[PDB]
Amino acid sequence: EKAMTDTFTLQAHDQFSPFSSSSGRRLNISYTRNMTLKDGKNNVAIAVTYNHDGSYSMQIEDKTFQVLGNLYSEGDCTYLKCSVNGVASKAKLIILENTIYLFS
Amino acid sequence: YHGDSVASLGTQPDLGSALYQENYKQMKALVNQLHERVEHIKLGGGEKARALHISRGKLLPRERIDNLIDPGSPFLELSQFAGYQLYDNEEVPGGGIITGIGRVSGVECMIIANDATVKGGAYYPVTVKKQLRAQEIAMQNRLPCIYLVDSGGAYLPRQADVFPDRDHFGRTFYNQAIMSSKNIAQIAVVMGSCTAGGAYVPAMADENIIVRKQGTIFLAEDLGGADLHCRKSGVSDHWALDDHHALHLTRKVVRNLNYQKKLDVTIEPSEEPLFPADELYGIVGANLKRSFDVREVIARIVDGSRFTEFKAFYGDTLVTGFARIFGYPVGIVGNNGVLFSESAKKGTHFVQLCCQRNIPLLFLQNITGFMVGREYEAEGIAKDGAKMVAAVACAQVPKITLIIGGSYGAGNYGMCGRAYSPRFLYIWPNARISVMGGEQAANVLATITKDQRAREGKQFSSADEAALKEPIIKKFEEEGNPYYSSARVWDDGIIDPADTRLVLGLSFSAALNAPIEKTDFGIFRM
Amino acid sequence: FSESAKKGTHFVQLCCQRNIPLLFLQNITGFMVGREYEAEGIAKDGAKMVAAVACAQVPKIT
Amino acid sequence: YHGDSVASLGTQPDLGSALYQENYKQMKALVNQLHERVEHIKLGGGEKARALHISRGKLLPRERIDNLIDPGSPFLELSQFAGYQLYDNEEVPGGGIITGIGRVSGVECMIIANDATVKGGAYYPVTVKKQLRAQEIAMQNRLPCIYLVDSGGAYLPRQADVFPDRDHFGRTFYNQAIMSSKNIAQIAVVMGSCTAGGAYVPAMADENIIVRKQGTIFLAEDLGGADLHCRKSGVSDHWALDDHHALHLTRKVVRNLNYQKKLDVTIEPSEEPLFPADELYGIVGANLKRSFDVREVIARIVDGSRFTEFKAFYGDTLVTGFARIFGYPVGIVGNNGVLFSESAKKGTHFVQLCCQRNIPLLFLQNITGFMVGREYEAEGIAKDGAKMVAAVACAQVPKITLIIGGSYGAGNYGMCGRAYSPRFLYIWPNARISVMGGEQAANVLATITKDQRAREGKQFSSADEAALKEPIIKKFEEEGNPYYSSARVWDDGIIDPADTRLVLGLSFSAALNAPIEKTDFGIFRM
Amino acid sequence: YHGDSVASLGTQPDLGSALYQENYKQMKALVNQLHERVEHIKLGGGEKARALHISRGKLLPRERIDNLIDPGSPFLELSQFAGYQLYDNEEVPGGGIITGIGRVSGVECMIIANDATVKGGAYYPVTVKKQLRAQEIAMQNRLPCIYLVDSGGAYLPRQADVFPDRDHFGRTFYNQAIMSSKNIAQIAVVMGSCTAGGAYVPAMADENIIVRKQGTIFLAEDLGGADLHCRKSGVSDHWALDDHHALHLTRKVVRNLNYQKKLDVTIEPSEEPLFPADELYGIVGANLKRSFDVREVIARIVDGSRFTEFKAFYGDTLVTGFARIFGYPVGIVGNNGVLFSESAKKGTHFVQLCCQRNIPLLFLQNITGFMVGREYEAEGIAKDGAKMVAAVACAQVPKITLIIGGSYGAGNYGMCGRAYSPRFLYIWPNARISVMGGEQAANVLATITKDQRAREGKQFSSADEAALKEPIIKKFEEEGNPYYSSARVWDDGIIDPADTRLVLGLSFSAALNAPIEKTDFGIFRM
C-alpha cells in the first residue's frame, strides 16, 4: 500500500505534502488497524498499531509482536526485509490476485 | 541557482540548567494530561452505548473514518474538546460529532460524522457550532464535504440555542447550497436514522448514499430510508448493503469528481528542522511570566531551521521573516515582547510584502501582561496598532494562527485572532486568553472601589481590598484555561508542541486547495 | 405541500431571472390539523425551495 | 490512490444459442454490404476519369490525403455515403468531395479535398452541404482547415439549390472568414483549376499554396493560377512544382502555426475492454423488435469494461453512468426501453452532473416502437420529456451521439439528435429513423379513413384497409434506411459496430482541442 | 452646435418625359399585382374554413394579432408569400403561419401564430423554415417571442423534410431553450389544439397561457389542455376563459418582464425626405437593362435628403456615405454599376469606418448583367472582391439589405446576401436573383456545345443553337422572379417601393434592441 501511495505521489504536483506519507498518524492518539487474513480455512484477526517511529505493533490473539521492515528490489524480484520481535529475516514477496506469496 | 550557503536559526539549550529541567517537567505533565483526556473522549458515549451500536451491525464512528480515508494517510481532527464540561451534568464527548480533514482517493476532503453513541446523535448547541465551523473551513479552502449522517435530531431542552438564529441549525443547509453552487462537492452517506429536519442533509447533497437496512430518511424503514427512498422516492443515488459497502462507494464517488490540485506558490524540497521538537518543552515551559525567544520556536519548525529576518533591529519586540514549511513559503509573525509603535509599523510593512507576493502568513501569538508596564502612554500604541489590525483583516493570503502563550486585549486582534478569519487557529496547552490579564483586572476593580469608598469616607481596609480581589483572579483563571476555550469552539484544537510542525504542514497543505486572490486594502491612516 | 414547494421554487427562479426583489410573508400552520400526512413526501420537495431561496441574490425581505 | 478494485460490466454471451447465431449472421451480412459499397465509392469517378486525372500529372484525391497526413496515422473520414443514390440518374461517389480529420505535423486538422474525377469536381447541392458540415465540425472543435482545391464550379442545372440561400455555397466563404477571425488557421492548396467563385477560396485563406502548371485561379494558365497569380498578382503565398511538393509545403505551414494542444479533463491510462467487440454482432443483430441490454454494448467499448451506474434502480429504461474511453472521462446515456417520466427526470439530473464537472457526454440512441404501448397516457411523458430536451440543448460539454437502433419522434430530440448540435453523430448499419414507426403510421391512417368512411356510410372493407396500409409501410422503410439518411448529410457516417470504440476515441480526442465552456441553463419547469 | 446648413441630395424628375411615364406605369402594375395577391393570402384557408373556425368561438389568427398589439401600432409582417405556389396542387397561404414584429405593452416582440384555417394548422416544410427564420430574427435582436399556438402537427406526407435534420422541426425547441437561457422571454398562448410534439411548445416556454375549453396539450379535453393541464398537471401558468381573455393576459405578462429599451447610438430629430417616395416608380421602372442613379433612391428615404458621400470620385460605381433614417445613424452602400477593384477597396474602407463607430449598415443591391462586359479581366476583381466579402461577413453592426435590382453571382455575397446574416433582407417587386444572368448562361452553354459539336464535326446549326438557348432563358426567368424567391424564405418580404422608408425605420428600430458588439476582423489580404 505504501508503494502504491508513492506511485500516486510521483504524478502529483504537491510532491512533498505530509498527506502523501504512510505514517497513519493521528492527533494525541495512536491509529490501530483491524486486518483480517486467511490461513488455510482459518481467519486470523490482526490488530496493527502504527507507531510514531515507523514500526508496527501487531497483536494476534494474546501475543504482541514488534514488526519493522522495508521493501527492496533485487533484479526483477521484490524482497521484504523485516524484523519480528528482534528476529531479522529476508523473503521474496509476491502479491497476486488475493494471495500473498512469501518465499524464504 | 540555489547552491548558496546560508545561516540557520536556533541554539542548543542547556539541558543541565535547572530552568530547563523545571520547564520540561511542567510542560510534559500538561501534554500527558492532554493525551489521557483525549483517550477518554475517544470512547464516545461508553461501553454500553458502543456495544448497542455494534449490535445493530453498524461501524463505530471513528472506524468509519479509518475505512473512508486512504490507507495509512494522516487524519487532522478538529475541535476534539468541543463540549468538554460545557454542560453542567451532561457529558458530550467531542460534541457528538467528529470533524477533520483526510485524504479520500487522493483528494483532501472535510469529513463530518455524527457520533450516534453520544446522546443518540442528538444535536446540542455546541454540535451545531462545531459542524458550522467545519463547513466554514471546507468552503474557504474548497474542500469537498462528506457527511456520515447518523443523527437523532435537535436536543429539544435547548431548542432556543439550536433552531432560530442565523448561526443555528438552519445555517447548515444554507452552507450546503452555497458550496454546491461553487462546485465544492457535497456528498452525504446516510448510515443510520435521519430524523426530522436531518432528511434535508441527504436531499441537499449533490450525490447521496444510503445503507439498505439501517438508513432511514423522513421529514421507520417503511416511512423513510426505505427501498421507497432508494427507488420509489428517488432521494437515494446509491444503495449500499452495509457500512463497509457504503464507504467503498463513497471513495468511488470522490474519484469521479474530475478534480486535480494545482499550486499557486513556488515549491522547494522539504527539510527537517536542525533541532529536536521536544526541546520546546524545556524552552517554553508553563510559566507565562517568564519570557523566551520566539526565534527558538521558529528554529524547530521551519525547513532546515533557515529564516530570513525582516527589520531585525527595528521594533525588536516583534519578529517577522520568511521561511519554508514542508516546501511551502511562509511569512512568520511572532511576538517577542510588548507591542510598540515601531513593532506595529514593522508588522504592517511585512504584511503588505506577503500579500504582494501571495505568501501564506503564520502568526505566533504570545502577548505580555501589563505587570511590567502600567500604561507606557498606550495612547501612542492606539494610533499605530490599528494600522496592523487593518492590514491583517484585509489580507487575502491564507492565514494560520498559533497561540503559544498569552492572548489579551487588542493584541489578540492585531495578531489575527479568531475574529479575523484565520484559516486555522491552534493553541498550546499552556495558553491563556482573556480581555485583560487577571491581575490587572483586579487592580482596576480595586481602584474604583477604594475611591468610591473614599467619597463615602467609609474605610476600605487592606483586608477588604484583598477579599474583593480574590474572586476576580479566580474567574479569570478559570475562563482563560485552554480547555474552557477549546470546549467552546474558539480554536480548532489543542495541540502538543512536538506536533506543531506536522499540524502546520497539514493545515497549509489543505489551505492551498483554493487559489490565492489579490488583496485589496483600505485606507492606511498614515 | 409538495405542489406548494414546487410552485415556490418555480416562482423564485422567475424573480431571480428578472432581478425582482422578493418579499416573504411567513404564517406557518400548527400540526393539530394533520399529525404526519406522509411528511416524507414533503421532505423531497421542501428542500428544492430551501435551496432556491438560499441562492437567490435579489434583495429579500421577510 | 487509484488501487481500489472495482466491479466490471458485461457477461459472456451464449455463442451456441440459436438467437446469437442468427443475430451474428444478419449483422455480418450488413457489415459486408457496407464494406463493399465503400470500396466502390473509393474509386470515385471511374477508370477513365482516374486515368485522365493521372495523365495530367496530378495525384488522385485520396493519395493526396495519404501523403498529407503523418505517416501511418489514422484518418477519420466523414460522410462517405453523401450523395448515394441521391440523384435519379447521376452517380456522385461521396458527393464529389472527401472530408475527414487527420494529423498533420502532429496537429489534428480538418481536410477538405475536391474529387476532380467525379463530374470534374462540380459542386452538387449535397457537395455544398458536406463541405459546410465539415467547416462546422472544424469551428466547433478549433481544428485548422486544409482545402485541397480542385473544382469545376457549381452545377448549373441545380443552381437554385447551391447559390442563393444562407446554407448555400456563399456560406463557405462566410465560415472561412469567421474561423480566421478566431485564429483557426485556414490553409488552401490549389492543386487544380479554381473556377469562377472558387478563386475566392485561395484568396480567403490565411496562407495559400498553388501548383506551378496545374493550378489556375480566376474569378487558363495566363488568366489565373499563372506565375501572374504567384508573383504579379500576389494571390499565392507559396509556389509548388508538383502535387508532392505542395503537400510537403503544407506540412511545413502547419508546423509554423505555433499551436500546442492542452487538455481540460483529467486523464488516466488507457485499457482495452474485457470483451471482444465483434460479439456485438450476435448481441444486437438486425431485428429492431427484439430487445437487448445496452449495458452489453457499453461493456465492450469502455476502458476495462468499468462502469459506475447512476440511479440504477430508478427509471430503469434509461442507463446513465461514468466511464472512460482511451483515458478520457465520459458520461454515457443509453436507452433500455420506452422513456418514462422517471427516465426523463433521471436523465435531466445526470446531464446537470456532467455539465458541472465538465465531462463529455455520449448518447446511445435505441428508441422503441409503440407496438407494445398504444398511448400509456403519454401526456405525463410530455411534461417531463421537455426537461431533458432543455437540459441536453443547453449543455456545453462535447456531445457525441451514436444511433444503435431506432430513432423515432420526440425520443430523438431528448437523446441529442442532429438538431441539437452533437459534435459528431454516427449510426450503425441496422438503424431506422422516422417521425414514427411505419406500423403506427399505418394504423393512424387507417383510423382516419375508416371513420370518415363511416360518416359517408360507404363500407371500408378489410381489403380496403390493407390496400391503404401497404404503401405507407413501404415508404417508411425506404426512408428510414441507414443509407437514405447518410446519403443526405444527417449523420457523419455509417460505422461498423466492431469499430465503435476506435471511432469514439478519435472523435472525442478531436473534440478536446477546444476548451470546455461553462454551461448556462434555462428555466427548469419543475 | 448643429446649426450648419448643408447640401441635400436628389433632383426633380421630368414627369413629362416618356421614360418616366413608361417606368411609372410598369412599376405601378407590379405594385397593384403585389397588393391584390396579398389580399387573397389575407383570407387564409377560405370562407368555409373561416366560418368553421369562428363557429368554435375562436378568433381568426389575424384578429388575434390585432388585439394583442398596442392600439393603432404598426405591425411588420414577414414572409407574407411563403409557400406561394411552392407545392404543386396544395395552396398554403402564408405557409400556414403568421410572423411579424409588433409592440405589446410598449415592448417590441416577435409574434408567431399558427393559421388553423390553413390545412388545419399542419406544419409544412416551408412552415418550419418560416418559424425558424422568425426565431433567428428574435434572438439576433433580443425580441421576446409570443407563440399563439393552434396547430395540427407535422404534415406526414412530407415528414422527411420536417422532422430529421438540424434545421427541421426539432430546431424550434432548441431555439426556445437557447433564448430562455439568454433572458429573452418565451411566452406561449395555447389557443387551440396542441398536437403530438407541439405540446412541448407550451412546456418549453417561460410563461404559458391556455384557453379553458379550446386549448388541448397532449404529447381531447380530458387527455390534455384539460383543467388537468391547468391544475392537476401544472403545465399551465395562466387560465383564460376565451381568446380575448388570453390576449389580455398576454399583455399583462409582457408588462412584467422588467425590460426597458436602451439605445447605443446617438439620436437626432427625425425629418421627412425632401422628395415624394412614389416618384421612385418613374425613376426605377421595371427594366433592369436601363440604369438609374442610386443617389435618387437615397434622396427619397433619408431624413431631409441629407447625405455625406465618402470617396465620391473614387470607384464611382459604388456609392457610400452617412445619413439618418428616423433619427438613427446609417451607413449606406449601394451599387451604381459594375464592381471594380477600386469599388471593392472603397467599400472595404467604408465598412471598417462604420464598424469602428458602431453605425448600422444598409445595403442597396442592384448588380449589373455581363452583356456590357464579357470578362474585363475579372481575375483582378477576384483579388479585391474577397476583401469586401471578408469585411462584410465580420461586421457586427446591424446590417439590412434591400435588393432594388439584380443580384447575380459573387456580387450578391459582397453586398451582404442572405448567406451573410443581415438582420433583415427585403426585395422590390422588380428584382431578379440568379447565379448568373440568363443570357450569359445561354452563351456559355452555346459555346460548350458548339465546340464539342466541332470535335464530332457534326454541324451545330444556327437553328440548333437557338433551340438550345430558349429553354435556358426560360428557366432562369422563372427562377429569378421575386415571387419564387419569396415563396421560399430567401427574403423577409416583398415591399412596395413607396413603403421603403417606413419598413427600414421599423426594421432598424427593432434591431437596436440588442447592444452593438465590437467587431473583430480576420486577416486583410493586402
DSSP per-residue letters across E22-35: HHHHHHHHHHHHHH
B73 interfaces chain A, CB cutoff of 8 Å = yes
After which residues does a break in chain E occur, C–N more than 2.5 Å? 219
Q: What are the residues whose beta carbons fall under 8 Å from the beta carbon of E13, sequence distance 6 or more?
A: E20, E279, E282, E283, E296
Distance from CA of E16 to the nearest CA of D (A): 39
Of C39, C44, C54, the CB nearest to B235: C44
The H-or-E segment that residue B102 falls in is strand B97-104
Is chain C in touch with chain D: ≥3 Cβ pairs within 8 A?
A: yes
Provide the H-helix boundaries in E256-340.
Answer: 280-284, 294-299
Asked if E435 and D520 come within 8 Å (Cβ–Cβ), the reply is: no
Q: Are B359 and B397 in contact (CB under 8 A)?
A: yes
The H-or-E segment that residue B341 falls in is helix B341-357
Q: Are B185 and B206 in contact (CB under 8 A)?
A: yes
List the grid coordinates of D328: 478520457
Q: What are the residues whose beta carbons fall under 8 Å from the beta carbon of E55, sequence distance 6 or more?
A: none
3-state SS track over E215-265: CEECCCCCCCCCHHHHHHCCCCCEEECCHHHHHHHHHHHHHCCCCCCCCCC
Q: Which residue of B has its CA nearest to D343?
A: B234
Asked if D526 and C14 come within 8 Å (Cβ–Cβ), the reply is: no
Pick the closest to residue E64 from E117, E26, E27, E10 (CA basis). Answer: E117
Of E178, E203, E393, the CB nearest to D386: E203
Strand, helix or coil at B123? strand
Query: How far apart, in whole angstroms, are the C-alpha atoms of residue E14 and residue E22?
Result: 12
State the DSSP code for D217.
E
Pick the closest to residue D251 from D144, D178, D151, D179 (CA basis). Answer: D144
Q: At what angle do helices D170-181 and D125-141 cross, to 10 degrees?
A: 10
Question: What single-letter amino acid sits at E53?
Answer: H
Distance from CA of E47 to the nearest CA of D (A): 22
Asked if B199 and C55 come within 8 Å (Cβ–Cβ), the reply is: no
Strand, helix or coil at E391? helix
Residues in chain D closer than 8 A to C10 (CB atoms): 523, 525-526
After which residues does a break in chain B occur, C–N more than 2.5 Å? 219
Neighbours of chain C (3+ CB pairs under 8 A): B, D, E
Asked if C17 and E183 come within 8 Å (Cβ–Cβ), the reply is: yes
Neighbours of chain B (3+ CB pairs under 8 A): A, C, D
Q: What are the residues whose beta carbons fall under 8 Å from the beta carbon of B1, sequence distance 6 or more?
A: none
Q: What is the distance in angstroms between the CA of the first residue and the CA of the last residue of chain B?
A: 40
Residues in chain A closer than 8 A to B267 (CB atoms): 14-16
Query: How far apart, in whole angstroms, are the C-alpha atoms of residue A52 and residue A21?
Result: 12
Q: Which residue of B has its CA nearest to A34?
A: B63
Burial class (CB in 10 A: 0-12, 13-18, 19+), A104: exposed
3-state helix, strand, coil split of chain A in percent (to 5) is: 10, 55, 35
Asked if D383 and E233 come within 8 Å (Cβ–Cβ), the reply is: yes
Query: How far apart, in whole angstroms, are the C-alpha atoms of residue E433 and residue E486?
Result: 11
Q: Residue E261: phi, psi to the nearest 5?
A: -75, 135
Query: How far apart, in whole angstroms, are the C-alpha atoms of residue A35 and residue B72?
Result: 13
E225: alpha, beta or left? (left if phi > 0; alpha if psi -120 to 50): left
Q: What are the residues whose beta carbons fall under 8 Å from the beta carbon of B482, sequence distance 6 or more?
A: B427, B428, B429, B430, B431, B432, B494
DSSP assignment of B31-42, as one string?
A: HHHHHHHHHHHH
Q: Which residue of D has its CA nearest to A9?
A: D1
Resolution as reported, in Å: 2.5
Pick the closest to residue B172 from B190, B195, B198, B207 (CA basis). Answer: B198
Strand, helix or coil at A72? strand
Residues in chain E closer than 8 A to C20 (CB atoms): 258
Asked if C19 and E258 come within 8 Å (Cβ–Cβ), the reply is: yes
3-state helix, strand, coil split of chain E in percent (to 5) is: 40, 15, 40
DSSP assignment of E436-466, as one string?
A: S-HHHHHHHHHHHHHHHHHHHT----HHHHH
Q: Long-range pairs for E501-505 at CB < 8 Å and ≥24 separation?
A: E501/E273, E501/E277, E501/E300, E501/E301, E501/E325, E502/E74, E503/E76, E503/E426, E504/E301, E504/E325, E504/E362, E504/E400, E504/E402, E505/E325, E505/E326, E505/E328
Asked if B263 and A14 come within 8 Å (Cβ–Cβ), the reply is: yes
Of B177, B180, B219, the CB nearest to C42: B219
Pick the closest to residue B216 from B196, B232, B241, B237 (CA basis). Answer: B196
Q: Are B273 and B301 in contact (CB under 8 A)?
A: yes
Nearest-5° Cα angle at B367, B361 to B368: 155
D1 interfaces chain A, CB cutoff of 8 Å = yes
Residues in chain D closer than 8 A to B239 (CB atoms): 312-313
What is the distance, to the nearest Å, from the Cα of residue C53 to the centroid of all Cα atoms in its chain? 7
Of D2, D266, D346, the CB nearest to B258: D266
Q: What b-and-e string marks burial along D301-313, b requiring 16 or more CB atoms within 10 Å of the CB? A: bbbbbbbbbbbbe
Asked if D4 and B103 come within 8 Å (Cβ–Cβ), the reply is: no
Q: Are D83 and D124 in contact (CB under 8 A)?
A: yes
Asked if D526 and C17 come within 8 Å (Cβ–Cβ), the reply is: no
Strand, helix or coil at E20? helix
CB pairs under 8 A between D and E: 205
Nearest-5° Cα angle at B247, B242 to B251: 145
Pick the closest to residue E157 from B290, B145, D476 (CA basis). Answer: D476
Query: How far apart, in whole angstroms, are the C-alpha atoms of residue D382 and residue D372?
Result: 19
DSSP bridge partners of B399: B361
Query: How far apart, in whole angstroms, are the C-alpha atoms of residue E376 and residue E378?
Result: 5
Mutation target for B interface from D314, D317, D351, D361: give the one with most B CBs within 10 A. Answer: D314
Of D174, D197, D413, the CB nearest to E170: D413
Residues in chain A closer than 8 A to D2 (CB atoms): 8
Asked if C13 and D525 come within 8 Å (Cβ–Cβ), the reply is: no
A103 interfaces chain B, CB cutoff of 8 Å = no
Largest pairwise CA distance in chain D: 83
Residue position matching grid coordinates 501572374: D228
Distance from CA of E231 to the nearest CA of C (A): 10
Asked if C20 and E258 come within 8 Å (Cβ–Cβ), the reply is: yes
Residues in chain D closer than 8 A to E435 (CB atoms): 154, 156, 159, 162-163
Nearest-5° Cα angle at D408, D404 to D414: 85
Q: What b-and-e string marks burial along B487-511, b requiring 16 or more CB atoms within 10 Å of the CB? A: bbbbbbbbbbbbbbbbbbbbbbbbb
Asked if D177 and E433 come within 8 Å (Cβ–Cβ), the reply is: no
Residues in chain C closer than 8 A to E255 (CB atoms): none
Q: Cα dist. D509→D394, E159, E345 in Å?
A: 22, 35, 42
CB count within 10 Å of CB B463 equals: 8
CB count within 10 Å of CB B244 equals: 13
Strand, helix or coil at D268? coil
DSSP assignment of B392-438, as one string?
A: HHH--S-EEEEE-SEEEHHHHHHT--GGG--SEEEE-TT-EEESS-H
Strand, helix or coil at D350? helix
Query: How far apart, in whole angstroms, are the C-alpha atoms of residue E354 and residue C44?
Result: 57
Query: How far apart, in whole angstroms, are the C-alpha atoms of residue D421 and residue D361?
Result: 12
Question: What single-letter amino acid sits at D44?
Answer: G
Task: Tell me which residues of chain B have a C-beta less than 8 Å from any C-beta of chain C.
Answer: 173-174, 177-178, 180-181, 196, 199-200, 203-204, 217-219, 223-224, 228-229, 233-235
Q: Which residue of A has its CA nearest to D3?
A: A4
Query: How far apart, in whole angstroms, are the C-alpha atoms of residue E428 and residue B293?
Result: 93
Nearest-5° Cα angle at D54, D48 to D59: 130
For the four alpha carbons of B500, B501, B503 and B509, in that order, the dihedral sign comes to: positive
Question: What single-letter amino acid sits at D66?
Answer: D
Q: Cα dist. A59→A55, A81, D161, D425 in Å?
A: 13, 20, 85, 61
List the grid coordinates of E520: 473583430
Question: What single-letter amino acid sits at A73?
Answer: S
Query: How far apart, in whole angstroms, are the C-alpha atoms of residue B436 and residue B370?
Result: 9
Pick the closest to residue A87 from A104, A56, A65 (CA basis). Answer: A65
List the grid coordinates of E501: 422608408
Asked if A1 and D2 come within 8 Å (Cβ–Cβ), the reply is: no
Query: How far apart, in whole angstroms, are the C-alpha atoms of residue D365 and residue D491?
Result: 13
Q: What are the residues whose beta carbons fall under 8 Å from the beta carbon of E231, sequence distance 6 or more?
A: none
Q: Residue D293: phi, psi to the nearest 5?
A: -85, 115
Query: How far apart, in whole angstroms, are the C-alpha atoms of residue E379 and residue D183?
Result: 28
What is the distance, to the nearest Å, from the Cα of residue B226 to the centroid of all Cα atoms in its chain? 38
Query: How far apart, in whole angstroms, are the C-alpha atoms of residue E296 and residue E283?
Result: 8
Q: What is the distance in angstroms between the CA of the first residue and the CA of the last residue of chain C?
A: 20
List the grid coordinates of A85: 520481535
Pick the closest to residue D280 from D429, D430, D431, D498 (CA basis). Answer: D498
Is chain A in touch with chain D: ≥3 Cβ pairs within 8 A?
A: yes
Strand, helix or coil at D353? helix
Residue position matching grid coordinates 410530455: D382
3-state SS track over chain C: CHHHHHHHHHHHHHHHHHCCCEECCCCCCCCCCCCCCCHHHHHHHHHHHHHHHHHCCCCEEC
E105: alpha, beta or left? (left if phi > 0; alpha if psi -120 to 50): left
